[PDB]
Design a protein around this nucleic acid. Structure first.
Lengths: 95, 80, 22, 145
RNA sequence: UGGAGGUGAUUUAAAUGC
RNA sequence: GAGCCCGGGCUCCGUGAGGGGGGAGAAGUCGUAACAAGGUAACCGUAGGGGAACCUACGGCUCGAUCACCUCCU
RNA sequence: CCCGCCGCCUGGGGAGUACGGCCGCAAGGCUGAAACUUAAAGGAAUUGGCGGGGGAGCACUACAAGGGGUGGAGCGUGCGGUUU
């Protein structure tokens, strides 16, 4: 039984666009905005996140349109599941 | 004029992959000074290797854009 | 170290003193 | 001779020595000139009212991460841009943009923002001349405009 | 028993890690 | 005999494109500089050169190196 | 341990820098901050681990010496992966 976490609340799917260094990445989000996102230390010490990865972004409560935290990074098999379920589109992944 | 160029990834040491730049006319263009300028743009190590410049890491777009800034034809440059 | 710094300080000084002289 | 001249008539040397060597206490020097009083806006004061230009949230320091509630307020006569740390949990709520916000320092005027916060020199007490610790408790008074 | 010089010096052992 | 005015000089307050550095953030890159003789001892003042850490020359110093070889001293 | 005088210091980093002045042909020197930031900077000794630090000594998961073999094939097996 495959199970895949989903964005909740005001969280958004995003594709990592650029590594900015020191736990920061620009992420192209499913609402069509690029957000500058922090990777929390807890996540940094668990996973390797790279350009092109699909992630869940939590927008910050202030400047919500410009900033967020990355809270999850999907594996490739999870990405394929999300595609099949229509949660994201191939056009979105490629950009 | 007519000066073409190739910019692509080239195996290197620690990091991931170097960057190779070739195709300059070595009788007109000083690769030593070009390399020094490029090394400042990428903030990485590098050398002139024969008639090419090798930079540590992946700086293909950076290099291409800087070369255009320096007066080299946009259409003479290919990133692979 | 103090090699570093002395020449960094000197280069800063010169370059800037070049920018003042100019 | 452990330093000092000792001798009846010498004293003046003493008298200037001290003073010469007093100015190695940063604090003393600073007050006696009044650098404490000139730099870190206020014009010295206990507190200052100012209009809340916007609300901003910033990141925490080195071992830490958490969204502190900070305002941007402009002191009115001072006419200076101050970013500021807001006490309390919910708070950022009870502060509407363009209410008056009185501002103080927090934890030694030296410059020292508390350990967590990078910048913030200062504290907020008030929203429309009623404070934040009064608005964390529901009963006491609740806000207007 | 513990201290100061003077000169051979050894390249056969490789950069990095939150 | 004031204020007032006029022309010039000098200085100071409110404020401005642009520009310098600091204490930082520590997930990108380059290298291995120092800390073990750090793998060419290290530092030092001076001078030149190198993208960078830095290298080299000349003089100094040990806060200097590990045996070995030679020399002295309770 | 006392008595006399003199220079210098007053946490770190900013910075031995800016500005100003003085001196110097030039290179530079002498004099010399502040904004800001930090709960350390530092010193000696102790222990341990470590060094392509030095001496002594062992080992057979060590190396030499030596005999055999794995890595080539087929098959058995457990795994990585993929598939389901």
């Amino acid at each position: 039984v495959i199970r895949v976490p989903l964005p909740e609340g005001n969280q958004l799917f995003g594709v990592v666009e650029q590594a900015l260094g020191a736990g920061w990445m620009d992420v192209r989000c499913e609402d069509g905005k690029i957000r500058r996102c922090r990777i929390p230390g807890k996540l940094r010490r668990r996973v390797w996140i790279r350009v092109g990865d699909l992630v869940i972004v939590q927008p910050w409560p202030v400047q919500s349109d410009k900033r967020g935290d990355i809270v999850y990074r999907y594996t490739q098999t999870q990405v394929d599941w999300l595609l099949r379920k229509g949660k994201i589109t191939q056009e979105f992944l490629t950009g | 004029e007519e000066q073409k160029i190739k910019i692509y990834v080239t195996k290197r040491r620690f990091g991931k992959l170097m960057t190779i730049i070739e195709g300059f006319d070595t009788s007109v263009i000083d690769l030593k000074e070009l390399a020094k300028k490029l090394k400042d743009i990428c903030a990485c190590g590098g050398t002139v290797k024969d008639n090419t410049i090798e930079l540590q890491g992946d700086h293909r777009k950076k290099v291409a854009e800087e070369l255009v800034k320096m007066g080299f034809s946009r259409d003479s440059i290919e990133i692979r | 170290m103090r090699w570093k710094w002395i020449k960094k300080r000197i280069r800063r000084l010169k370059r800037q003193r070049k920018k003042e002289r100019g | 001779g452990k330093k000092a001249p000792n001798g009846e008539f010498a004293g003046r040397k003493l008298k200037l020595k001290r003073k010469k060597f007093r100015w190695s206490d940063i604090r003393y020097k600073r007050r006696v000139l009044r650098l404490k009083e000139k730099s870190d806006p206020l014009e010295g004061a206990p507190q200052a009212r100012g209009i809340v230009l916007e609300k901003i949230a910033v990141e925490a320091k080195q071992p830490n991460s958490g969204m502190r509630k900070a305002v941007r307020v402009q002191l009115i006569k001072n006419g200076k841009v101050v970013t500021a740390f807001c006490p309390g949990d919910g708070a950022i709520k009870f502060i509407d943009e363009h209410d008056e916000v009185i501002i103080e320092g927090i934890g030694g005027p030296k410059g020292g923002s508390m350990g967590d916060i990078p910048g913030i020199r200062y504290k907020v007490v008030k929203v429309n001349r009623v404070s934040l610790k009064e608005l964390v408790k529901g009963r006491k008074e609740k806000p207007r405009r």
